Amino acid sequence: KRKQVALFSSDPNFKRDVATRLDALAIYDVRVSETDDFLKGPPADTRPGIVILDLGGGDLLGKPGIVEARALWATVPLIAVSDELTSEQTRVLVRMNASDWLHKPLDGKELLNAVTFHD
């Protein structure tokens, strides 16, 4: 019934605030994990609806098989959250085919607009 949301972040403030915001909307089943858990792809016991990936400074974009790991998630919408990136990092982000590029600190409205657009 509820739309599964996989959230990946190494920022404790961001994890708490995004899970609280989406869980207050009641129509989302939100799972939270470390940024590098994204590389593992979806678990066989789940059915992802949306992925929220907190890239931070963009350390994960320099990981060798990152664009291939995105394909493990098939065509689920991907919401990318990051601080400012370089052109080289923006290239990887473009290949990762995210529907939204949110800049930290994200406002309430911007995240809810990105998630509800795919509903």
Side-chain angles (χ1 to χ4, degrees), residues 2-33 35-46 48-108 110-119:
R2 283 176 292 197
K3 194 181 207 173
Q4 281 164 47
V5 182
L7 173 65
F8 301 96
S9 183
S10 287
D11 172 348
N13 300 295
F14 177 84
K15 281 173 136 174
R16 189 288 188 183
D17 292 322
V18 169
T20 301
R21 274 187 185 115
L22 294 185
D23 277 352
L25 295 177
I27 64 176
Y28 300 118
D29 183 52
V30 184
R31 162 176 48 97
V32 179
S33 306
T35 294
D36 294 348
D37 275 44
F38 171 85
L39 298 171
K40 286 163 183 189
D45 53 271
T46 69
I50 301 147
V51 170
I52 301 167
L53 178 65
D54 177 17
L55 293 158
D59 315 74
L60 195 74
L61 299 161
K63 251 89 190 291
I66 190 54
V67 176
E68 292 88 344
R70 191 272 191 258
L72 293 169
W73 294 87
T75 46
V76 309
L78 168 66
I79 295 160
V81 187
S82 77
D83 291 291
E84 207 211 299
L85 300 176
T86 61
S87 65
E88 185 191 79
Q89 290 171 313
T90 292
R91 268 238 172 243
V92 180
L93 185 57
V94 166
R95 293 200 295 272
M96 280 176 88
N97 192 9
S99 69
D100 306 276
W101 292 4
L102 308 174
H103 186 73
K104 260 183 181 180
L106 48 75
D107 51 301
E110 231 172 47
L111 176 83
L112 309 183
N113 280 21
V115 178
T116 62
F117 177 83
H118 301 284
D119 271 61

